[PDB]
């Protein structure tokens, strides 16, 4: 599977960041992937036409893709994930379980807050839990992930103003 997965390329096969098709003409990815020059591999080969906040980045694609079975978008969930929920991180798929935020507070050198969630067991890629996108990929330490539920509106807004 993973029909929502996309690759951001630098000139010409310099693979570097992942992205997730959230709507048929829209990708979501992490902020540190802000290159002012990239191409998109979704298969189809596209170009950015708009890029955005300091936590995630929205990319508007030159073409709206017709939802297929090999390429289809994934909905961004408004329900925040609860500890114990099992999810999968792809970008080669690993299984993980949401943890308490204090596991990440106790282990990380910086402050952790609501806009992230804590998860782990045994960039720009997706964390899918109940079949919907709930996070983005930001030693034996738990991972921190962007809590997309707290951003569901900033994307909606950002889409209306670039549509």
């Amino acid at each position, epitope marked *: 599977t993973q029909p929502w997965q996309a690759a951001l390329l630098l000139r010409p096969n310099q693979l570097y960041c992942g992205a997730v098709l959230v709507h048929p003409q829209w990708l979501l990815t992490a902020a540190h992937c802000r290159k002012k020059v990239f191409r998109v591999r979704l298969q189809q080969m596209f170009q950015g036409v708009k890029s955005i906040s300091n936590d995630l980045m929205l990319i508007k694609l030159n073409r709206r893709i017709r939802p297929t079975k090999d390429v289809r978008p994934i909905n961004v969930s408004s329900h925040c994930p609860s500890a114990g929920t099992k999810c999968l991180v792809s970008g080669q798929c690993l299984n993980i379980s949401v943890l*308490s935020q204090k596991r990440c507070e106790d282990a990380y*050198p910086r402050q952790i*807050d*609501d806009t992230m969630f804590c998860a782990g067991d045994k960039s720009g890629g997706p964390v899918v839990c109940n079949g919907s996108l709930q996070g983005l990929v930001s030693p034996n330490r738990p991972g921190v992930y962007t809590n997309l539920c707290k951003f569901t509106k900033w994307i909606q807004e950002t889409i209306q103003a670039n549509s």
Partner: antibody
Amino acid sequence: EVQLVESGGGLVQPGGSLRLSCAASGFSLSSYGVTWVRQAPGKGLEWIGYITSNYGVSYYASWAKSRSTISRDTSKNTVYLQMGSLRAEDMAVYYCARENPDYGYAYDAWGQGTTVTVSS
Amino acid sequence: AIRMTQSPSSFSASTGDRVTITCQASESISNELSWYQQKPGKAPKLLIYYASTLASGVPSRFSGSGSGTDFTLTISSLQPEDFATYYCAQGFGSSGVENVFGGGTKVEIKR
């Protein structure tokens, strides 16, 4: 034995500063975070904040962030609470307590409590 | 922004009775919930953690239940030395929190 011994609670005049020490014996601050909680006479438990075990990151109650600091001396295995601009509302018994991650960070070992009186 | 609330503020029952007191989280905290007993003039003591596992030395008449937002502490048979105030505390997250503790429930004994 795990033990948290507190010191530094006394009579402070209004607008003064409090400095409190929580000296940990029987365990290492690099393995256990420590919390500060206070209690006014006849009232409930009021969390002030805590400092993590690994990098010593401080988390504060929203009401406490602007005036409080929680810090760690790893060589003395001692945790500190500092507070300025003291008012009547800060008169309280101040406890420190250890967070045990195996019990999901529950507070399993408490200090004896040190009393801070804001008076002139 | 997790808020914890306890109910009732005051609980009176008779010796030997079953006692049930509640605690609620404004958002899900899974089972990261702990219960503390504070006898008069003493530091609080941990009774229950992970919502339902008894700490060493806690009398078996204590038990705790729940997961998510609604939690229960229970005393199967109220003994005199159970006179105290009971607090719950979430250990799910620390950011944007006013207080990790609930307001407490004072247990009073009718004899």
